[PDB]
Amino acid sequence: SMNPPPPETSNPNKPKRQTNQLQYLLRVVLKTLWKHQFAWPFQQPVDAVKLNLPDYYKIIKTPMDMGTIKKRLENNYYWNAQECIQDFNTMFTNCYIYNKPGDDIVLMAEALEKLFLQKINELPTEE
Numbered sequence: 001s002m003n004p005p006p007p008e009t010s011n012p013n014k015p016k017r018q019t020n021q022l023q024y025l026l027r028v029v030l031k032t033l034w035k036h037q038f039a040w041p042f043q044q045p046v047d048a049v050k051l052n053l054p055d056y057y058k059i060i061k062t063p064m065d066m067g068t069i070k071k072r073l074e075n076n077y078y079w080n081a082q083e084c085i086q087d088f089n090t091m092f093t094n095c096y097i098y099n100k101p102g103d104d105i106v107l108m109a110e111a112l113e114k115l116f117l118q119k120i121n122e123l124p125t126e127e
């Protein structure tokens, strides 16, 4: 079973903003997670072919990854911070739903999620 098309990172029909919260989401939140030692499995869409996960996209119908989020932030895809926060949460949720407690990938997601929560706890108020 092939990979699906990746999530959209460009859509000229979609209204966009550059906001201080979205800037924080790139400069602080994404940056922190991206540089982490456990970031690598999450830096691009799950390649179900290479990774021999033929049931992945049967189970996971809203795929998300930090490669996609990074592109969405750098290319100003979002209207608001909540959209981006939802993408991160979708990414973590997918990992927990597909895998089992104590799997390496789940421990990796937990570490990244801890940092995610720490950083969005201090999301600045809108300017």
Ligand SMILES: Cc1ccsc1CNc1cnn(C)c(=O)c1Cl
Binding pocket: 041, 042, 046, 051, 053, 094, 095, 098, 099, 104, 105
């Ligand atoms: C590359 C790697 C590292 C530990 S397990 C694994 C392959 N499978 C993966 C990869 N990424 N993600 C997000 C998954 O949920 C699954 Cl199950």
